[PDB]
Motif scaffolding. Sequence first.
Motif, PDB file in Angstrom:
ATOM      1  N   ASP A   1       0.842  -1.200   0.000  1.00  0.00           N
ATOM      2  CA  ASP A   1       0.000   0.000   0.000  1.00  0.00           C
ATOM      3  C   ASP A   1       0.876   1.249   0.000  1.00  0.00           C
ATOM      4  OD1 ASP A   1      -1.903   2.143   0.986  1.00  0.00           O
ATOM      5  OD2 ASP A   1      -3.222   0.478   0.969  1.00  0.00           O
ATOM      6  N   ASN A   2       0.352   2.381  -0.504  1.00  0.00           N
ATOM      7  CA  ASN A   2       1.044   3.658  -0.334  1.00  0.00           C
ATOM      8  C   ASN A   2       1.156   4.054   1.147  1.00  0.00           C
ATOM      9  OD1 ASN A   2       1.336   4.175  -3.222  1.00  0.00           O
ATOM     10  ND2 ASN A   2      -0.505   5.358  -3.291  1.00  0.00           N
TER      11      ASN A   2
ATOM     12  N   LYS B   1       4.684   4.875   3.062  1.00  0.00           N
ATOM     13  CA  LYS B   1       4.871   6.111   3.827  1.00  0.00           C
ATOM     14  C   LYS B   1       5.069   5.865   5.322  1.00  0.00           C
ATOM     15  CE  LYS B   1       3.567  10.913   4.448  1.00  0.00           C
ATOM     16  NZ  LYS B   1       3.263  10.928   5.901  1.00  0.00           N
ATOM     17  N   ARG B   2       4.424   4.874   5.939  1.00  0.00           N
ATOM     18  CA  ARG B   2       4.664   4.510   7.349  1.00  0.00           C
ATOM     19  C   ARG B   2       6.133   4.182   7.616  1.00  0.00           C
ATOM     20  NH1 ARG B   2       1.185  -0.149   8.053  1.00  0.00           N
ATOM     21  NH2 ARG B   2      -0.342   1.403   7.660  1.00  0.00           N
ATOM     22  N   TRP B   3       6.787   3.451   6.719  1.00  0.00           N
ATOM     23  CA  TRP B   3       8.230   3.215   6.786  1.00  0.00           C
ATOM     24  C   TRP B   3       9.048   4.488   6.574  1.00  0.00           C
ATOM     25  CZ3 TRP B   3       8.278  -1.539   2.825  1.00  0.00           C
ATOM     26  CH2 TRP B   3       7.644  -2.649   3.407  1.00  0.00           C
ATOM     27  N   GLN B   4       8.642   5.391   5.686  1.00  0.00           N
ATOM     28  CA  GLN B   4       9.307   6.676   5.485  1.00  0.00           C
ATOM     29  C   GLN B   4       9.244   7.560   6.732  1.00  0.00           C
ATOM     30  OE1 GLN B   4       8.793  10.671   2.584  1.00  0.00           O
ATOM     31  NE2 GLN B   4       8.480   8.663   1.796  1.00  0.00           N
ATOM     32  N   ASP B   5       8.082   7.721   7.352  1.00  0.00           N
ATOM     33  CA  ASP B   5       7.946   8.498   8.582  1.00  0.00           C
ATOM     34  C   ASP B   5       8.783   7.936   9.736  1.00  0.00           C
ATOM     35  OD1 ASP B   5       6.183  10.427   7.482  1.00  0.00           O
ATOM     36  OD2 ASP B   5       4.399   9.301   8.001  1.00  0.00           O
ATOM     37  N   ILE B   6       8.977   6.618   9.818  1.00  0.00           N
ATOM     38  CA  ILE B   6       9.914   6.027  10.777  1.00  0.00           C
ATOM     39  C   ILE B   6      11.360   6.331  10.384  1.00  0.00           C
ATOM     40  CG2 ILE B   6      10.787   3.882  11.771  1.00  0.00           C
ATOM     41  CD1 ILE B   6       7.784   2.840  11.454  1.00  0.00           C
TER      42      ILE B   6
END
Length: 601
Positions: free
Chosen positions: A232-233, A237-242
């Motif tokens: 999913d997008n 993004k959840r991995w990017q914010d971490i």
Amino acid sequence: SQITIQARLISFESNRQQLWKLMADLNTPLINELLCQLGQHPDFEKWQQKGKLPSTVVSQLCQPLKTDPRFAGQPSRLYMSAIHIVDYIYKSWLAIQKRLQQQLDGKTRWLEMLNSDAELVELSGDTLEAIRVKAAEILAIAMSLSKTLFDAYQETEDIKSRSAISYLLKNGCKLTDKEEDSEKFAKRRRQVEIQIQRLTEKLISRMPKGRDLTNAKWLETLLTATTTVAEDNAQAKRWQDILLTRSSSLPFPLVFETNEDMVWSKNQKGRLCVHFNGLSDLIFEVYCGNRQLHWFQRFLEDQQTKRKSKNQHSSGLFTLRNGHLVWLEGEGKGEPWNLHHLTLYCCVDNRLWTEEGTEIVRQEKADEITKFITNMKSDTQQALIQRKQSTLTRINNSFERPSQPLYQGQSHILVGVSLGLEKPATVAVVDAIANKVLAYRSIKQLLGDNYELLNRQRRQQQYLSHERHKAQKNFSPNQFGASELGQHIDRLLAKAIVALARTYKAGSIVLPKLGDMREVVQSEIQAIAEQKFPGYIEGQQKYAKQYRVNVHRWSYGRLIQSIQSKAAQTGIVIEEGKQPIRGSPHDKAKELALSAYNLRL
DNA sequence: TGACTGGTTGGCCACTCAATTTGCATCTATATAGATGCGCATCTATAT
């Protein structure tokens, strides 16, 4: 009245390394005890409704964690430090959330109440004069005023004639003959809608976070994101914010809320030393400038005076109140306990320095303790009353201390201080029975030799804001600002204002009820900008950037605190009043002081 | 017995208008040097 003083603590590695290991291990149950409330606790929403944390809940979550295999290796005072910090985290955050909830409701009222003159005519089925006549009757009934009119709209709908109560409230609790421009009314009603929207957004806040030192979530996320494919997008993004998140390098400080849980001594070399309850093997040496040494000698004299007197004097009047032990960040390479710097921050109640000031705290505590005992009047509750009554008895036995007669000012002489964007301060000294200004000061007088520093602050803010922009585009670590210069200027003005108050024997210093100027300006400039760039939201945000930025940089709360602190160390009373919307900076200061004098009765 | 430890409740462009400068054409009302015509003196000629 309190102040904080500080010293670095020096010891040999073995002691600075052993303390680090305990704080890196203690820092973790400060995280786990947050999570045990952040998502585990079922009652959480009841606390958000009440605005206050129950006084025992953090201890009841910590008590079973004391035997946890991960947390069991720590002294009884390091668990009390954990319980203290997590109690103060939540006890702050819930009290932020409650005032936001109250503001949102307290304006949701007003967005319903605020109606155009034509809407009042339609809603009443009557003339705007009939509304003026009913508004005159409502003021005659009322004569707490603004609250009484709000309550008289919240009660007493009165066949929609609360329309006239809203007519008073929008006119500032007064009668008005003029009939208003619907464009000016549209801007006014839009500002309230903007405040309502902004409050419904700010109503949700990020649940208070722990300082994770482990990098474990970040390392796990890195090897996940580089070796696997997101479904999913939202997951990508959840991995990017971490992965973008900067991790902390310092553990939470130890808090020692009991002054006697620091023990002082003198080293063979003549230097002062300290040790903490539960860490009584680890002697530390005090290093501080002679500009602050007199408190660290006083700590040891307070302690020796009690020990020489068979405990018949109380630490209820010890000059030290509580200590916060913290690792300040060092520079370059080395193990954390060799790179960072143990610093002990001592809370001190400054009025305990003298005997005349110690007597104030004796009377203050003796009245508070007496009331506590009479409000209380079970087994351990009797043991608590033994602590209290041993205090209520012992507090009357005096320490031998420096003597200095208390300051006394004239009850009619006031210093008015006016704050603004162009003039950070401006002063009028008024004799309120003569209605005579004794003196005025503008900034060029009010910090004299230092007046070059205002021009320096404006140059440094502008110069450094541009360099930070240029540096960010290159990913340079160099990021600097004028914050310590602004802090110094706010302290120079605070000393000069109180020196002026002493010079004229003023009874009080008067500070304006500025309130939340930042949010008010943000809503006003938005309601206006929406009329000039309709639909072009990027143009609405660009409308008055330098004005909105200068208001968000305006240090009024820090100058107000700097004056409060220096005034209370001198003994001068602080008073408050409405600051005029029109007049010069002097007229603002003059009318502010006279208004605060008129508010005496 | 005096130490230790634990307790605990606006910007970029396009368009428009008052103005105000500058230049040119058109009176206009006075100021001022040259023909033209009497009005008498003066000389010459002629006659009884």
